[PDB]
């Protein structure tokens, strides 16, 4: 219940672009696919995701789609640091 919470809602909404981009590259409808991401995740706490071979949603651990945690950690961490530096810019002055 704060203005910081309203920013976190946009933080959660903008983070969903990765499965949306996978839907467009695979040709599937993003809303139909992302609707299944919401329908299966309240019960499935992990290993639920998209598989490109079958073109649908399934258990990724059975299909063997795994990645390190440091990759996703560095992505969220470095992305927040880059936005921290860009938003502090106010003027674009030419120099030597």
């Amino acid at each position: 219940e704060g203005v910081q919470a309203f920013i976190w809602q946009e933080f959660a909404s903008a983070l969903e672009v990765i499965p949306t981009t996978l839907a467009e590259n695979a040709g599937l409808n993003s809303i139909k696919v992302v609707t299944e991401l919401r329908s299966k995740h309240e019960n499935g706490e992990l290993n639920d995701g998209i598989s490109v071979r079958r073109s649908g949603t399934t258990n990724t651990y059975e299909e063997h789609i795994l990645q390190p945690v440091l990759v996703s950690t560095s992505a969220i961490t470095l992305a927040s640091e880059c936005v921290k530096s860009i938003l502090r810019i106010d003027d674009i002055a030419f120099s030597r």
Binding site: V17, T20, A23, E24, N29, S30, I31
Partner: protein, 63 residues
């Protein structure tokens, strides 16, 4: 019109076809007009003395 266009930019990123976007605003625009036509009140029942005041309400708004 820019507000509809700015919100349409986010929906184009999701991959919605533009005709479904355009049909959505057409159904939403008529639905909003149908609701606002019911909630607004009529002023013709009042006499001419109060009807002059309603013009003064809108005249001060426009100036």
């Amino acid at each position: 019109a820019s507000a509809l266009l700015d919100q349409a930019l986010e929906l184009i990123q999701k991959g919605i076809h533009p005709i479904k976007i355009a049909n959505g605003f057409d159904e939403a625009a008529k639905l909003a007009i149908s609701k606002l036509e019911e909630t607004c009140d009529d002023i013709s029942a009042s006499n001419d003395e109060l009807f002059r005041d309603f013009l003064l309400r809108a005249a001060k708004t426009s100036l």
